Symmetry: C3
Subunit: 205 residues, 3 copies
């Protein structure tokens, strides 16, 4: 019951809704969760949505399970950070004698890994900046520019994106982070979808 999480394109006949895991497996420094899908903008594959990601830099991108990524969402890793101790001008880029002035890896600023929780909804055209972490259950409004962390089960938006409000009271939130239904076996989940959909799954747990 349910789609094949190994299938790149879960909906037969439809090449717009895609499962990220299959696609990003061929890539390094990227761990993706089962059932997270990307809703193509112009029929593009989610791998083009990840910019400036280089193995040599070693920063990682992690995405949880049951994530809904809207069309146009872009993820910016650290490969485009400029050295900022002095001038930001990439002299080395233009060779002809300038390559000699090339940064040492420890000279380029790395803001860290980018982590996206489970059951996270990212609206369309959302831009996510280097080294950000979006907690489980969070909802990132459309056209947001995420530059700082967002807390679990928080509704957020803007440029810079800011937390607007908690999706539920703290105890309801607290419990969901404990249950972690997204880590339940496919069959147990398939047997509680509706309780998970209306948050009533909390009571029986």
């Amino acid at each position: 019951m349910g789609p094949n999480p190994m299938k790149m394109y879960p909906i037969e006949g439809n090449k717009s809704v895609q499962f990220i895991k299959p696609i990003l497996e061929k890539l390094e420094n990227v761990e993706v969760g089962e059932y997270s899908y990307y809703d193509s903008k112009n029929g593009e594959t989610f791998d083009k949505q990840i910019l400036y990601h280089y193995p040599i830099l070693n920063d990682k991108l992690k995405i949880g399970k049951f994530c809904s990524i809207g069309p146009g969402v872009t993820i910016i890793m650290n490969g485009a950070n400029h050295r900022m101790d002095g001038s930001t001008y990439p002299f080395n880029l233009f060779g002809n004698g300038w390559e000699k002035h090339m940064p040492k890896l420890d000279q380029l600023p790395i803001k860290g890994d980018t982590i996206i929780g489970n059951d996270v909804w990212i609206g369309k055209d959302v831009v996510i900046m280097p080294g950000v972490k979006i907690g489980d259950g969070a909802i990132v409004a459309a056209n947001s520019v995420v530059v700082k962390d967002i807390a679990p089960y928080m509704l957020a938006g803007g440029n810079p994106a800011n937390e607007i409000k908690q999706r539920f009271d703290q105890d309801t939130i607290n419990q969901l982070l404990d249950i972690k239904w997204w880590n339940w076996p496919i069959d147990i989940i398939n047997e509680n979808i509706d309780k998970i959909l209306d948050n009533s799954i909390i009571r029986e747990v």
Copy 2:
């Protein structure tokens, strides 16, 4: 005198500027004013800029007259709101048995309809969110994201968009909201464009 409001491309030999009524009118749950235009960004027709609008959700989009809509402006309707009382994951979308957990219309509430007033100037690449109302005379800055209502004759901007300032004093605005020149027959408007252009149209009618 003046263009034909029924023409899709008012300006001869020009496929960039379009009159929005001829185009949208052809659609469901949409009302548009006669002279409002759209300055195409890449040649697209304004109908391509209205996203997630589904008859079944029954939300309407209203656009007044004499509106200036910049290129790339995007209007988001309620067709893509995920259920939110629990998980936001669209299980039903992937069928294969998950289609039974499909939302019942009353589990997908909406804030309201989207209404853009008359004589509104919306800058380029502005994104308009569901259930928002923009007042007559308002000016929305380029690249703004409208998430809440904007009052009549206000200057607003940003992401989220915020009201920056009032365009005129309160009386000029209330007088204007009264006169509603955009509602006059074409012939009477043609006679005062300059007065409507410099706002002196208030002293002629009012006084």
Copy 3:
């Protein structure tokens, strides 16, 4: 040593990165510095990134030297401002008798010249509005919408962009502003690229 600032495409076999100066020699009321470059988003030339620039209005765009313009940066000039003392509707635009209502230059808003300093790093998809000045050494974060001036050596971002942080303390900034290494004959620059890169240039030139 160092690239020829006159080459449109400095990096051999690579039509993505361009030196803005040679590429914009043709445009009017535009001044650009020698090593400023653009990082093309989809192959487009930078001249395509400057919008609503009409000589008639006479506003100018100035871009200093050694600037890093990220892909998709958009510079909006004054040719897009509507008349605002009354209706913002551009009747004159549709002709058919309406052209007569065409604005006299002095009736049209015009925020001034746009000025980008030296050694300025402008992030991806940044939109620069009209009449804005960006000080030397500033860094603009990707996706910002710059509506107001940005002081020298400041870190700014958002929509509207706000100054987030001073890169260095005031005296270091002032020294850098006084030294102006970007105005040095390239020979001298070439022998100090590394001191310019770690800021040790201040210590040697000031004391």
